[PDB]
C-alpha cells in the first residue's frame, strides 16, 4: 500500500544528477517518466527531470499545476520546508554521512579512543545485566 | 583506390592518411573535391586554425 505519490506540489529529494542532494517541488507531470519541477529556495531552476533521479518525500505544499516560480516560492516559504527537512531524520543521517566523510585523521584517532572507552563501559554493563538476569531466574 | 581519384588525391598532395592541405576554392577546385569527396573531410578553417 503506497503512501507517497507524485502529485502537483510533492517535495522530492534529488539523489543523483547535477542537482544532487537538493529538494525540489513537482510542478507538473510531463510524461510517464518525466516531470516539470522547480526548487525556488534550494537553487534549482525550473526544468524537466526524470522520476528515476528523484526520491519523493512526505511533504505536500499547495500551489496550482501551472503556477510560476514566484508562487512556488510563496508556497515554499509559508510551508517552511527547509527547516522541517533538516529536522527530519533523513537529512540528519545525510549530514552524518557528510561528517563521517569530512572526518580527518586526528578526528579519527579521537573517535577511536572515545569509541573504545564507550564500548568497554557499555560491555561491562551488558555483562552485569546478563549475570543479574541469570541470578534472578536460576 | 580508384585511379581517377588517386590522381586527384596526388594533385591535392594528400598521399597519406590524415594529411592536410590548404586549397583555395573555385569551380575547378570544387569539381575535384567532389571527385575525392568520400575519401576526404574538408571544410572552412578558422583564423586560429591557420
Amino acid at each position: 500500500v503506497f503512501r507517497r505519490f507524485v502529485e502537483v506540489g510533492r517535495v522530492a529529494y534529488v539523489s543523483f544528477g547535477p542537482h544532487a542532494g537538493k529538494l525540489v517541488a513537482i510542478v507538473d507531470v510531463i510524461d510517464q517518466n518525466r516531470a516539470l519541477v522547480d526548487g525556488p529556495c534550494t537553487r534549482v531552476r525550473r526544468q524537466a527531470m526524470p522520476f528515476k533521479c528523484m526520491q519523493l518525500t512526505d511533504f505536500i505544499l499547495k500551489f496550482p499545476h501551472s503556477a510560476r516560480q514566484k508562487y512556488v516560492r510563496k508556497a515554499w516559504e509559508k510551508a517552511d520546508i527547509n527547516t522541517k527537512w533538516a529536522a527530519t531524520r533523513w537529512a540528519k543521517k545525510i549530514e552524518a554521512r557528510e561528517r563521517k566523510a569530512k572526518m580527518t585523521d586526528f578526528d579519527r584517532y579521537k573517535v577511536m579512543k572515545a569509541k573504545k572507552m564507550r564500548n568497554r563501559i557499555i560491555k561491562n554493563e551488558v555483562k552485569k545485566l546478563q549475570r543479574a538476569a541469570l541470578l534472578k531466574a536460576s | 583506390v580508384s585511379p581517377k581519384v588517386r590522381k586527384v588525391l596526388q594533385l591535392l598532395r594528400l598521399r597519406q592518411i590524415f594529411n592536410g592541405t590548404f586549397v583555395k576554392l573555385n569551380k575547378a577546385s570544387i569539381n575535384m573535391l567532389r571527385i575525392v569527396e568520400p575519401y576526404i573531410a574538408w571544410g572552412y578553417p578558422n583564423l586560429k586554425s591557420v
Binding site: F2, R4, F5, V6, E7, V8, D28, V29, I30, D31, L36, R46, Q47, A48, F51, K52, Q55, L56, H65, S66 | -
Partner: protein, 176 residues
C-alpha cells in the same frame, strides 16, 4: 539524415540564382529539424528539390538560423504529421507527444518511429508540427495526462547502482 542526439530546430531561407529571366526569385522559408546547420541546409535542398524545380547549384542559402523555443518551461501537446517509408509502401501519420520544446518533441518522434515501426531517419519525413490544445488531442496516451489533480505512485522502484555495493549483505528493497 542521422538523428544524432537531440535535434535543433532551424529556419532556413533560400532562393534561386538571379537570372536575366528571373531577376529576383521568391524567397522560400522552411522549418528544418536537424542535429546541425550543415545537415539542415542539406535537408532544405532535399525538400525544396522535391517540391520546386530548384537545386543547390542553381540556388543559394540566404539565411540559416536556429530558432529557439518561445516557452521551454511550460509543457505542451505537439501534433506531428509524418510521411514515412515501410518495407512495402509509404504512409502518412498523425502522432501526439508531450514535451517542453518543439525540437524535443520531434526528437521523441524519431525515436518513436524507430522503436515502433523500425523506420530509419532517412525514410521519416516531417511535414507539419503544431502546438495542440488539450481539448483537441486524440491519442489516449497523451490525453491521460490532462488531469489537474494527477496522482500516481512509483510502484516498483528497481534498484539501480547495482555494482557500487556489488557484494552486499542486506537484500535490496524495492518499496519506497
Amino acid at each position: 539524415m542521422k538523428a544524432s542526439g537531440t535535434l535543433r530546430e532551424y529556419k532556413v531561407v533560400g532562393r534561386c540564382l538571379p537570372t536575366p529571366k528571373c531577376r529576383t526569385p521568391p524567397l522560400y522559408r522552411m522549418r528544418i529539424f536537424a542535429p546541425n546547420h550543415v545537415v539542415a541546409k542539406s535537408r532544405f535542398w532535399y525538400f525544396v528539390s522535391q517540391l520546386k524545380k530548384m537545386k543547390k547549384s542553381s540556388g543559394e542559402i540566404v539565411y540559416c538560423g536556429q530558432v529557439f523555443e518561445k516557452s521551454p518551461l511550460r509543457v505542451k501537446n505537439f501534433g506531428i504529421w509524418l510521411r514515412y517509408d515501410s518495407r512495402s509502401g509509404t504512409h502518412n501519420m498523425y502522432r501526439e507527444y508531450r514535451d517542453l520544446t518543439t525540437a524535443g518533441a520531434v526528437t521523441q518522434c524519431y525515436r518513436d518511429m524507430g522503436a515502433r515501426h523500425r523506420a530509419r531517419a532517412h525514410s521519416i519525413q516531417i511535414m507539419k508540427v503544431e502546438e495542440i490544445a488539450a481539448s483537441k488531442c486524440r491519442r489516449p496516451a497523451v490525453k491521460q495526462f490532462h488531469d489537474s489533480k494527477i496522482k500516481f505512485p512509483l510502484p516498483h522502484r528497481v534498484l539501480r547502482r547495482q555494482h557500487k555495493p556489488r557484494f552486499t549483505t542486506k537484500r535490496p528493497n524495492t518499496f519506497f
